[PDB]
Each structure stands twice: as structure tokens, then as C-alpha cells.
Design a binder for this molecule. Structure first.
Ligand SMILES: [Ca+2]
Ligand code: NA
Ligand code: NA
Length: 484
């Protein structure tokens, strides 16, 4: 009846991190219930194995690798989605939906890198790309500034503690994680992550001031979840689109005390529990307001997982049997399947049958055109150019695979998934991530082709055996790049 649409997008949540995807080590009852009430997808792909390019593509319907700078965004990047670029929020606006973006961003603010006046109004910001309401973290949790932005101004701005940010130069007189580990009363770094100190945890980049506007990590989930509930409640009488992007499970993991210290995988496990709690809070509010039946929830993750992403939180020591990538090789940053094959759940009780498990090959690039079909919007010519309408497959009304899926690795090496085949194009990249995480990249100077029917773990390179399959996969990348 113009259904509401909520995208719940986790950060760095792996295929294997949720209980309903097979781990013995963490209880995720709210997400398990959500899946039981709809579809659990086993073959959904993000477009990229890193945060910024993945989110760029799902919000614009354009592969990030078409646009210079989407894969190397500065710590204080300007807007990566420019106001001239058509977004999923613009699409919903044109169906007379109220639009909101709450939580994690990864996509820049203001005009050019470093030009944000944190003591004033930021512009361009999310209202310039179609979001009526926004309450976002200014930066991901391991970066500065550690403040929230509400519609283009700093939330709870403190004029007694004016804000300054630099990714190039420290502020004289401010402590740093490297110089002053005695001030890290909550959490110490592993690799890098040893610059500004906020809330007893060091960060990437330098900052001064903030005062009352500075976040506390243990309250981030509560804060963003509360804002998501308020957006739903204020819009209970009209169609809305909410893009709810959690901080969890991004580093630093430092969850609320109702969770912290309770899961034996350590703070990383507690962050999965906290994610599940946030999902439960959304589900409870839809039930309280009688919105459950006519609300489409799409829950997924921007990219695959990482154990040690910069903090001394014992993630590797305490993982035990828990495989964040599920059956897949690699992780965040990688060209291997754990980089882009992510959890994905759809619940929409009016239209989607309960208790389904579907292996349909699908890509997040298709959300904008698929949801345009749902809400009867014709996207203008040339806009969302890589997005295809697969609404029937996303709602389990069809089992038709996407003809192929394109995956972008951190080095911009592209891969193709087509039926059972996975092709990785050659690159000069290192076989391991070099800066801290011990993640296999799948970078190699020769063609790689894997039969995912024979093993979900990409171990046996069949490229030399099947030149005709390699040529078809390479021809797909030529065709995709030629649309530029
Ligand atoms: Ca991410
Ligand atoms: Na860019
Ligand atoms: Na715009």
C-alpha cells in the first residue's frame, strides 16, 4: 500500500558472523527471527570488499570503480556522492516517500577534502542527495572527528570546545595514542590507530575540541538505534524509506555494558550481539506501531569481515571455531568470495513467504532499480546505469539468477561471478594485505577461475583447463568497462 522500506546495513559483517549462517559461537535471536519470517539469501554480493565503494554503488546504482577517488577517499573526504548524482533517496522522494539516513556513512561530507567547517554548517550534505532527515557519524568509528552530524550541523555542538580536524599534522599540546598509551583507558591499538584520543580509545587522524559533542563508543548503537526508532515513529502515518547503517561490527568494537564482556569471542563477538540487539529494537517498534506487515526490511552488510582491523581486542586469539567468512576464502579488502558474499535477509510479510532459504545470485547494485519497480518510479535515462530490476528475485517470487555479478577488490582488481564460476582478473597486488590484517587478497599475475559447485573455498585454479570460460568472463569485464 506504498510499503515502507528499511535497509539495515551492517558494517564489515561477514557471511558467517550471524547464527542463522551456521556459527556455534554467537546467539543472534532477533536476526534469526527476521530470517525465519522471510528469506535468508545464501548468494548475495556487495559490489566491493571495502566500505566506501560498496556503499557508493548500492546508493547510486553505479559501480564505484567507474569514478576516480571512490576507492581512496580521504579521512576528511568531501561528498563522494555529488549533489548532481541520482540516488536511491531521490528515487524514493519521487514516489512521495519521506527519506532518512541514520548511522554510518563512509561517503564524505562538504565540498572538498578538509574544507568542512565543523564549527558551522556543512554543505553539501545528505539533504543535497535526497535525504530529508539525517543523523550520521561524521566518520567511521576508528577515524576523526568522533561526533554526529544532524542535517548539516554538529549534534550537541559545544561552542566552549571548537572542533579542528587534520589528517596531516598533529595539534600541539594534544595527547596521542602513540605518545600517551597511559590515556587509553578503554582500548589500545594493534596496527596504526595511534593518533587522536577520544573516550580512552585512539583513532586515525588528529583532532582538537568537541566537548559535549564527542561520542562515547559504548553508546553509539543506542544513539543511532534511538534515532532510527524516532524516524519510524514520526513517519508512522506515511510512506518512508530509512537507510539504517549500523556502526557494528566496525572497529573499534566497544559495546554497551549490557553486552560487553559476555561473548567468549571478545569485543568482536559482543559487537555481533549488539548488532542483533539493534535489529530487535527496529522489529519491536514496527510491531508496536502496527507497521510490520507493510514494511519491507532488507538486512545486509557492505562487505566481508576482518578479525584484527586495528585494535588490541584479541579477535584472532578468541575466534576459535568461528569463521567470519563462513565457507569462503578471504575477507574484507579481498578479491576472494568472503570479501563480497554477505549475509542478506528480506522480510516483507504482505508479499514474501516465511521460512525461505534462496541461493539466487544477486547484487546490491540492483536495489535502486528493483525498489523503483516496487514503488512504480521510472528512473530517468542514464541514471543508476549499472542497476538492473530483479525485484521478483529479491522477494523470492522468482529464482532467476543475475546473469553475472561484478566484484571490486581494495586494489580495484575486478572479479566476475557467473553461475558456478568465479573469475579473478590478474593484478600485480601482494597475496596478503600488508598493513596489519592477515587477509588473503586473491591477487595474482595470472588468470584465476574457480568452480564454486566443487568447493565454496576458492583453492583449485581451473583457468588453464577452460580457456573458453576464461574468455567469456574477460569479455564480460570488457563489456562492463566499455559502458564508461
Ligand atoms: Ca565496511
Ligand atoms: Na570520488
Ligand atoms: Na541532488
Amino acid at each position: 500500500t506504498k510499503p515502507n522500506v528499511i535497509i539495515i546495513l551492517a558494517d564489515d559483517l561477514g557471511y558467517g558472523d550471524l547464527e542463522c549462517y551456521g556459527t556455534t559461537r554467537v546467539h543472534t535471536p532477533n536476526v534469526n527471527r527476521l530470517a525465519s519470517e522471510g528469506i535468508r539469501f545464501t548468494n548475495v554480493h556487495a559490489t566491493a570488499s571495502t566500505s566506501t565503494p560498496s556503499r557508493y554503488a548500492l546508493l547510486t546504482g553505479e559501480y564505484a570503480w567507474r569514478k576516480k577517488g571512490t576507492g581512496v577517499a580521504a579521512g576528511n573526504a568531501g561528498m563522494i556522492i555529488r549533489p548532481e548524482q541520482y540516488t536511491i533517496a531521490d528515487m524514493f522522494k519521487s514516489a512521495d516517500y519521506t527519506t532518512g539516513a541514520i548511522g554510518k556513512w563512509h561517503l564524505g561530507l562538504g565540498d572538498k577534502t578538509g574544507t568542512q567547517d565543523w564549527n558551522g554548517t556543512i554543505s553539501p550534505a545528505l539533504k543535497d542527495i535526497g535525504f530529508d532527515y539525517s543523523y550520521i557519524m561524521a566518520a567511521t568509528a576508528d577515524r576523526v572527528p568522533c561526533i554526529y552530524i544532524e542535517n548539516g550541523k554538529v549534534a550537541d555542538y559545544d561552542s566552549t570546545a571548537p572542533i579542528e580536524v587534520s589528517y596531516q599534522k598533529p595539534f600541539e599540546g594534544e595527547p596521542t595514542g602513540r605518545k600517551n598509551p597511559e590515556l587509553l583507558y578503554n582500548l589500545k591499538p594493534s596496527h596504526g590507530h595511534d593518533m587522536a584520543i577520544v573516550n580512552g580509545i585512539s583513532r586515525i587522524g588528529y583532532m582538537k575540541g568537541g566537548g559535549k559533542a564527542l561520542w562515547k563508543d559504548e553508546n553509539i548503537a543506542d544513539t543511532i538505534t534511538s534515532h532510527a526508532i524516532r524516524f519510524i515513529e514520526e513517519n508512522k502515518e506515511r510512506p518512508f524509506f530509512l537507510y539504517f547503517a549500523t556502526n557494528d561490527v566496525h572497529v573499534p568494537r566497544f559495546p554497551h555494558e549490557r553486552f560487553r564482556g559476555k561473548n567468549p569471542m571478545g569485543l568482536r563477538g559482543d559487537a555481533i550481539v549488539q548488532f542483533d540487539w539493534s535489529v530487535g529494537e527496529i522489529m519491536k517498534t514496527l510491531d508496536r506501531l502496527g507497521l510490520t506487515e507493510n514494511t519491507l526490511i532488507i538486512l545486509s552488510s557492505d562487505n566481508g569481515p576482518v578479525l584484527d582491523d586495528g585494535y588490541d581486542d584479541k579477535a584472532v586469539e578468541l575466534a576459535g571455531s568461528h569463521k567470519p567468512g563462513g565457507p569462503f576464502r578471504g575477507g574484507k579488502y579481498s578479491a576472494f568470495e568472503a570479501g563480497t558474499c554477505v549475509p542478506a535477509i528480506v522480510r516483507y510479510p504482505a508479499q514474501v513467504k516465511k521460512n525461505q532459504t534462496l541461493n539466487t545470485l544477486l547484487s546490491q547494485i540492483d536495489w535502486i532499480q528493483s525498489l523503483a519497480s516496487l514503488v512504480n518510479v521510472t528512473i530517468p535515462q542514464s541514471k543508476a546505469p549499472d542497476s538492473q530490476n530483479h525485484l521478483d528475485s529479491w522477494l523470492g517470487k522468482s529464482k532467476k539468477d543475475r546473469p553475472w555479478v561484478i566484484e571490486e577488490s581494495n586494489i580495484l582488481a575486478l572479479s566476475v561471478r557467473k553461475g558456478k564460476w568465479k573469475y579473478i582478473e590478474p593484478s600485480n597486488g601482494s597475496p596478503m594485505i600488508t598493513w596489519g590484517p592477515k587477509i588473503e587478497t586473491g591477487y595474482a599475475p595470472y588468470d584465476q577461475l574457480f568452480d564454486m559447485n566443487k568447493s565454496e573455498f576458492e583453492s583449485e585454479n581451473l583457468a588453464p583447463k577452460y580457456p573458453a570460460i576464461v574468455k567469456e568472463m574477460k569479455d564480460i569485464l570488457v563489456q562492463e568497462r566499455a559502458k564508461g
